[PDB]
């Protein structure tokens, strides 16, 4: 009967959509993590730069 085939097809479509949602959620999580790490890296780099400038300003005359 067509009803059983429709139910199986609705199973298939739902499984695919669930996989899509899994991927999407993972992508969002990845975006959230990567960015925090990048912020930390940027701050570390900024601290190093200023420190280097201070060292340079401290060991040069004019």
């Amino acid at each position: 009967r067509e009803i059983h085939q429709d139910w199986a097809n609705r199973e298939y479509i739902e499984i695919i959509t669930s996989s899509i949602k899994k991927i999407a959620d993972f992508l969002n999580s990845f975006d959230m993590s990567c960015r925090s790490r990048l912020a930390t890296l940027n701050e570390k780099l900024t601290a190093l730069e200023r420190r280097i400038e201070y060292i340079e300003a401290r060991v040069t005359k004019g």
Partner: protein, 79 residues
């Protein structure tokens, strides 16, 4: 936020180093020095994912810049 955070931290630092015997004597004489109420600014300080209209804002960087400027101004004022 940066201004009040800096003010609260400076007040707490100043209160920490104040002599306890002097505070007790003042309280006994009737001149109690009110303590600074506690706060939970650390949660906002540890925030790097403020999302607004699709923009990721590093609040920590701005707070760091403001506190650095305030500290430099305070040191210059002391000198």
């Amino acid at each position: 936020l940066a201004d009040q955070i800096f003010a609260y931290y400076k007040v707490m630092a100043g209160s920490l180093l104040l002599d306890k015997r002097l505070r007790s004597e003042c309280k006994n004489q009737g001149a109690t020095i009110h303590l600074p109420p506690s706060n939970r600014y650390e949660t906002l300080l540890k925030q790097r994912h403020v999302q607004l209209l699709g923009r990721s804002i590093d609040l920590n960087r701005l707070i760091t810049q403001r506190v650095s400027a305030a500290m430099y101004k305070s040191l210059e004022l002391a000198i």
